[PDB]
């Protein structure tokens, strides 16, 4: 009678950890959500085949409004698993589900799996230099979110990199590209004119991390805003002042302009 | 003609992803390093048996001085795997290794695995609120490094959490405890007098992340500094001002005192 929060990783169904797979295969009931992130290298079928169980997919409303009604009840008489893309507790509101489990009298365990928060390291940027993170959300109605712009500003001032998650509307199959993210930023730039993100700002694009051949590209906004980075999911990074070694990698591995090798210290 | 950087994960031999394991199996040669960090919950023996191949361990010098002599030569006519604890390239050094592969005309691919950078999410603290990170190193001789203290100040000043890696002497298999780290910080505070770390500061200790039974504890330094958090590895976190839901998780899941629901929110 326990509940397992198990991560499925970034791209493939094989991005789950061995530990996560052994445990999932022995659970009586398996649940999952696929709205917090996009797994572009697999299908629900392959995952089901991998763990050999039928997976009941839950929507954002099932989770946020009825997790303790749909999942926890069974978790008292059986071993239940809740699967999510990437790492199970990286979504802000997921950790709260453990509280719901407790109050319901159900013990829970967490099995980690690859997550962009860690996988960004493939960009070559020093992990310790990453500051506060943010998400670039789609504008809707008269509502135009801009908080993410200030996050970049605050970090850059301290010479820290900014990890930017791009928005996703799973039920509408809408996944923001790095290009769409850049456009929104150029706009907020005109709006706030703080000199944070312009055609000359250097950025890094990471698309489909977790796959064997992710797209890692670095360069100035003017030259990348129009570039094709392949299928989603996309993540966008606005680096702060670079260390020479970071620049070297970005140039040799992400095809960035040779000029960034000249750090203006 | 290919080199695979495969992450082994957090604690034991099952923390590697299924993808990582399968690829390691189909590789002709398998190397590994355990100088950047260790896998406290397993042994080279268990790992070797899981992969079903002999694993040649390389030292820091083997890698830093002769990686292109030991590893790359074989990767030109074979599929080679280089296993590392955690997630590859999160070590500030491994990134350049990809450049070396390129210089030697060897293509490289990265297979991710959970790292503390993402795993800290199990503390219930919002991932986006983590700022700059630091490592707490031991003072020795007439050298007393204290920059990690400064990092905390700057993060908390902006309401951000500080992830703190504790010193490790991999080859001597010695780990700094959270208790030791707390003691060092108080000593530093006693010199800097910045109000950054005191008996009343709220901290979070995460021990044996990746295990099914990790130790997650939150509370004031005065009460945690002599508490036994179990066997290493230990991770210390100094949270900034908390959102109510973060506080509730620390109380419900990490046993923090109710006092935090009014003092640190
Ligand atoms: N392989 C990948 N490449 C680029 N972005 C990714 C990604 N996997 C997830 N993301 C980003 O993460 C966002 C969801 S935020 C939750 C993150 C998730 N648990 C993780 O570990 O990554 C997505 O909208 C997407 O922009």
From Swiss-Prot, chains A, B:
InterPro entries: 4pyrrol_Mease (IPR000878), 4pyrrol_Methylase_sf (IPR035996), 4pyrrole_Mease_sub1 (IPR014777), 4pyrrole_Mease_sub2 (IPR014776), Dphthn_synthase (IPR004551). It comes from Pyrococcus horikoshii (strain ATCC 700860 / DSM 12428 / JCM 9974 / NBRC 100139 / OT-3). PANTHER family: DIPHTHINE METHYL ESTER SYNTHASE, DIPHTHINE SYNTHASE. Keywords: Methyltransferase, S-adenosyl-L-methionine, Transferase. This is Diphthine synthase. S-adenosyl-L-methionine-dependent methyltransferase that catalyzes the trimethylation of the amino group of the modified target histidine residue in translation elongation factor 2 (EF-2), to form an intermediate called diphthine. The three successive methylation reactions represent the second step of diphthamide biosynthesis. The diphthine intermediate is not stable in vitro and readily eliminates the trimethylamino group. It is not known whether the elimination reaction also occurs physiologically. Homodimer. The gene is dphB. Its EC number is 2.1.1.98. Transmembrane segments: none annotated. One of its GO terms (molecular function) is diphthine synthase activity. S-adenosyl-L-methionine binds at residues 10, 87, 90, 115-116, 166, 209, 234.
């Amino acid at each position: 009678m326990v509940l397992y929060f198990i991560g499925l990783g970034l791209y493939d169904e094989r991005d789950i950890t061995v530990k996560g797979l052994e445990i999932a295969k022995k659970c009586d009931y398996v649940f999952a959500e696929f709205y917090t992130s996009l797994m572009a290298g697999t299908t629900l079928g392959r995952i089901q085949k991998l763990i050999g169980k039928e997976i009941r997919v839950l929507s954002r409303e099932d989770v946020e409004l009825n997790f303790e009604n749909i999942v926890l009840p069974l978790a008292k008489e059986n071993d239940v698993a809740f699967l999510t893309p990437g790492d199970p507790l990286v979504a802000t509101t997921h950790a709260e589900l453990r509280i719901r489990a407790k109050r319901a009298g159900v013990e829970s365990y967490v099995i980690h799996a690859p997550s962009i928060y860690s996988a960004v390291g493939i960009t070559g940027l020093h992990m310790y230099k990453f500051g506060k993170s943010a998400t670039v959300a789609y504008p809707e109605g008269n509502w135009f979110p801009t908080s993410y712009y200030d996050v970049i500003k605050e970090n850059a001032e301290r010479g820290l990199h900014t990890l930017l998650f791009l928005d996703i509307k799973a039920e509408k199959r809408m996944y923001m590209t790095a290009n769409e993210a850049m456009e929104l930023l150029l706009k907020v730039e005109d709006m706030k004119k703080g000199g944070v993100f312009t055609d000359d700002t250097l950025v890094v694009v990471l698309a489909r991390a977790g796959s064997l051949n992710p797209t890692i590209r670095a360069g100035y906004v003017k030259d990348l805003i129009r570039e094709d980075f392949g299928d989603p999911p996309h993540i966008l990074i606005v680096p702060g002042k670079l260390h020479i070694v970071e620049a070297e990698y970005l140039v040799e591995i992400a095809g960035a302009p040779r000029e960034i090798l000249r750090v203006n210290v």
